[PDB]
Design a protein around this ligand. Structure first.
Ligand SMILES: [Zn+2]
Length: 241
RNA sequence: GUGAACGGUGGAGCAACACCUGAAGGAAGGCUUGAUGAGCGUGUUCCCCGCAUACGCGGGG
């Protein structure tokens, strides 16, 4: 519940691969997940391929992967956590917009860990911190480390439901990009320029990029009700074995 | 040791093909280069204006 690699044996039960070396000597942190490798725990020397391009998100330059993050670099872990929230009892999916509606509005009370892929297969699990508090959520989205406050998401959603109550067409006040890629991601629309007051506009610039990315999955004409995502920890474990 | 440090928006692509500014329409009706200025009458002291300042000068008809 402290390091992102803890879910290897806390969220989902797993063990070392038994071809891993035993650490002898002084303390050194794992290159992935920033977990200190003590004396006696199993570790692997660093054998990343040339296709690994996340050297900028490595926690340390010790060139040693802890066994939990050896499990975390496995391909079934890589496509199993392409969109997943890992609570203290299981791994659930956030692929649907109703699942992100559940995650960023009334979050689960566990100290979870949120990963989401901005591409096909990405190293997501180890390079994000564990969110200890529901109010402050660390979301990994591709090369982006995002922080989402569900209270600010609730305030923006209440603002949007106020300015779009009674109207026939649900027009968004501020445009949000799902990929977080367009220039106008966070830019105020003309309808939102005419239908929001000044302090609401400064609020919509003042939100964090993670809240913008979350609102991108929950600001559209059909509004997703918070529905808990389907539990996928059985699918990941079966794939892992 | 600025959640830092590192990171090319890139490569290629014909605005081009054909198209009559053209048809019709009177610069005319009337008007002396001919004159005009070229030569033809008065016969002796009479008014008025200035410079002067009256010794005289210029001058109107
Ligand atoms: Zn690790």
């Amino acid at each position: 519940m402290r390091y992102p690699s803890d879910i290897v044996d806390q969220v989902l039960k797993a063990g070392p691969d038994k071809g891993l070396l035993t650490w002898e000597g002084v303390d050194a942190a794992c290159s992935h997940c920033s977990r200190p490798i003590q004396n006696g725990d199993l570790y692997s020397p660093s054998s990343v391929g040339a296709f690994f391009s996340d050297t900028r998100d490595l926690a340390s330059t010790s060139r040693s992967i802890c066994w939990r993050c050896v499990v975390l670099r496995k391909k079934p872990m890589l496509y199993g956590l392409s969109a997943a929230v890992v609570t203290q009892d299981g791994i659930y999916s956030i692929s649907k917009d109703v699942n992100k509606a559940w995650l960023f509005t009334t979050p689960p009370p566990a100290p979870f860990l949120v990963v989401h892929s901005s591409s096909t297969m990405q190293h997501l699990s180890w390079r994000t911190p564990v969110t200890l508090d529901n109010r402050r959520i660390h979301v990994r989205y591709g090369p982006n480390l995002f922080i989402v406050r569900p209270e600010v998401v609730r305030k923006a959603l209440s603002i949007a439901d106020r300015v779009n109550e009674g109207q026939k067409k649900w027009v968004t006040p501020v445009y949000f990009d799902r990929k977080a890629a367009a220039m106008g991601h966070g830019l105020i629309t003309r309808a939102g320029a005419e239908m929001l007051t000044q302090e609401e506009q400064e609020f919509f610039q003042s939100v964090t990029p993670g809240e913008r990315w979350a609102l991108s999955y929950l600001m559209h004409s059909k509004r997703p009700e918070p529905e808990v995502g389907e539990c996928i920890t059985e699918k990941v474990m079966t794939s892992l074995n």
